[PDB]
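Budget justification note: compute hours in this period were largely spent on complex prediction jobs such as the one shown. Inputs:
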Amino acid sequence: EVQLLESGGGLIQPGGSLRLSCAASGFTFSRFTMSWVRQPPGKGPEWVSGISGSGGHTYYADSVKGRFTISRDNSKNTLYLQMNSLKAEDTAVYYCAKDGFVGQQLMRRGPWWFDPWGQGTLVTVSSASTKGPSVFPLAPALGCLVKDYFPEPVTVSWNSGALTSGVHTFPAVLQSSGLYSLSSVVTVPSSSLGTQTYICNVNHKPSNTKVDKKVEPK
Amino acid sequence: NNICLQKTSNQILKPKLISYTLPVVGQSGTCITDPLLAMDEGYFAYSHLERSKQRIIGVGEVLDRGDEVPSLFMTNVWTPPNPNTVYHCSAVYNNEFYYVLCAVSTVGDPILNSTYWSGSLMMTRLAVKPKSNGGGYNQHQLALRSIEKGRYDKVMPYGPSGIKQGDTLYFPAVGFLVRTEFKYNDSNCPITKCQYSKPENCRLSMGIRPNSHYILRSGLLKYNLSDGENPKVVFIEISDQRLSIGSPSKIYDSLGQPVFYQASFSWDTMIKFGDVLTVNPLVVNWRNNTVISRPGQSQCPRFNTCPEICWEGVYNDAFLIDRINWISAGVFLDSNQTAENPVFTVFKDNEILYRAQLASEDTNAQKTITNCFLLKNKIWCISLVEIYDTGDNVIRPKLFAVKIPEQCT
Amino acid sequence: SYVLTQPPSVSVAPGQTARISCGGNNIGNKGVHWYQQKPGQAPVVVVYDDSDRPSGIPERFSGSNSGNTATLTISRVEAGDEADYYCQVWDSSSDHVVFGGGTKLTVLGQPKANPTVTLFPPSSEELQANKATLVCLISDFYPGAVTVAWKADGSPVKVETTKPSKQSNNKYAASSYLSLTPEQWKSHRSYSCQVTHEGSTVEKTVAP
Ligand SMILES: *[C@@H]1O[C@H](CO)[C@@H](O)[C@H](O)[C@H]1NC(C)=O
Ligand SMILES: *[C@@H]1O[C@H](CO)[C@@H](O)[C@H](O)[C@H]1NC(C)=O
Ligand SMILES: *[C@@H]1O[C@H](CO)[C@@H](O)[C@H](O)[C@H]1NC(C)=O
Ligand SMILES: *[C@@H]1O[C@H](CO)[C@@H](O)[C@H](O)[C@H]1NC(C)=O
Ligand SMILES: *[C@@H]1O[C@H](CO)[C@@H](O)[C@H](O)[C@H]1NC(C)=O
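Corresponding output:
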């Protein structure tokens, strides 16, 4: 199938730099028009930039004109977006979208529509220093605690991907101080506790925290 | 005769809608596509498709409607049976008759079904002043003894109007050539000042897709009326100077010299027209115009000048009215990637002189056909603008009569 | 430059039709596209070029454009159709693509669900760090709006709770955190999480 894999998001001072990369697989990358659509948390999407198939024509939006720069490497099947002079407004999820139209027409009533979208990459423009989380075990169902981190996001996985069934990761809560905290849980039977070793693989990019915490009964 | 020759800001152009003078253009609840408007001397020819589907090929006169404004008055309408088979008509006038060359296909538009096309053509001769009880005069389907195409596999008319040189007709056409037999050295592709281009771009862009079976080469179809009782059609390919994909072209007389226009369906967004140096073989002294282009799509938008792999564009032609300064007139679309906002523009090679907006900035408008003439020693132009009605939800042609002002005030 | 206006929310009963309005100045002359975005997922395209449907999109999704308003009509609304919908266009007056504010479509008449509540005591490693925290995770409950009540040895306490977030399954989910000092966890010999949903309370206890 077709899939877009964004990367490069994170946490940066206002006026700083940031460059996102979009890996594309499943189609002739040079033949299609790529774009960057960003979406603030809990709001509608917004189109940041776009680039022609050959990269000859680049189209920006007035909100990021003069600050963002889109590029493209058709040999690497990858799309880029160089963000400079970042403002606090730019904090949003950044999607990578491919033009979905296929065919030999002369004119398109809608020259721009997207199919498919990526999975987004989180970019936070803030002046707040990052804080590393604390991984604590929830002993027995059983889970893991991720206390006092900033900023979003963090990822958690049980048994290094060898265990996805019945793992309900709950969303984080923003505490009064501004530091997030979340916990994931997975329900296991009591007929395999003293044998199957359960480890949660927590990962929090902005503070370089990668922790594997084993969860055993107390 | 002389016109306003300088760039001015006053709205001197006062276009007048004459659509209802031609009663067939305007109907309620009907989609009308594929238009043709061709004029020569005192007459004209018109065609459209009422997509009760019907093809209409008509002729008439360009007469003073009363207030010294020209309008089309129909004198003979032909309804060819089986309208699904008739595609890509082209009209040329000569000696009280109008010759309409048109393609016949049972596999759809031959451009989209190039391999399966039968290749059959048909030529119908319409009378401008038809006789009552007149068989073989009012309308008569001529017989073509042969279609000479050379190394091309198929030929087809591909344009609204053409010219007559004495007793010989010249329709705008296009040649279907097998892409393997297409000879092209990719070093000729001007990818010098285009760092994102490639040598193979404009070669692969000679077909509607890079992997296309055929390639399209514009040119002319020749019908010599003094060539036996049953004349034949011979194809005349256009030269390799500023080569683009075979597009709906148009060749017209203007001030005693033929002028050629080719639509921009490839990466050469800038307008492609100019005086004809030789008809056979075809050589067009293209203008080096840098101000008029056409709306395309995403990769080949308006004003693009770099060789790209694309097949996007629309047909907006121009008409030379003052050869001394090379001032042309035409309705163009002020838009980059959509078919919107038609504007009647009068321009030179490097300067738009004066303009007039025909509709609103977001009005859907596709094909534009412009021809100019004289009315009592005054220069007039009648344009056909395909426009989408906001209410009826159906695209439809529209006829505007624009006078070229003499003063600039 | 160009402006697309969408009503904030639409409510339809199951099996009926749901029509989502997308308003725009002379939007008939423009190609309207539609994107559906379920929670935690990327927007998927359900209609393009006014009326064309993508491959794999259910046929009950149909788009129509005429005049100053294009309407995406969802025929035979299902429970899974609960998502955010955005109409999209290209503004050739500034060479931007423009989106709409969005429309959250909630489907009426879904049965009520019970909150699966589980309470975890402070971890042994965390308790050694002289700081404690109790967690209460409510899972799968409809309609999504609950109240949490933290108690200490049967006595109420004076704690951070999250906003109810919709889950993959259409039933909502949320969590709440109670932070305490190391003495309070062992001073009182009991601790319980009390949550009420539609006049019915669920509880869970933990002991040192
Ligand atoms: C081309 O014509 C053939 C012959 O019937 C037909 O099978 C095919 O579907 C046509 N394709 C197009 C694109 O018109
Ligand atoms: C194409 O043109 C280049 C430059 O003139 C020349 O070096 C090359 O040999 C040509 N190729 C062919 C096949 O003639
Ligand atoms: C047309 O044919 C006649 C006789 O066959 C010939 O004298 C004349 O030159 C031809 N004209 C053209 C334009 O081919
Ligand atoms: C356009 O420029 C080319 C190159 O200078 C020239 O050969 C051609 O004659 C020009 N076209 C004109 C003057 O119409
Ligand atoms: C169309 O393109 C030109 C240059 O490519 C640009 O100056 C103009 O602003 C574009 N049109 C719009 C509406 O942005």
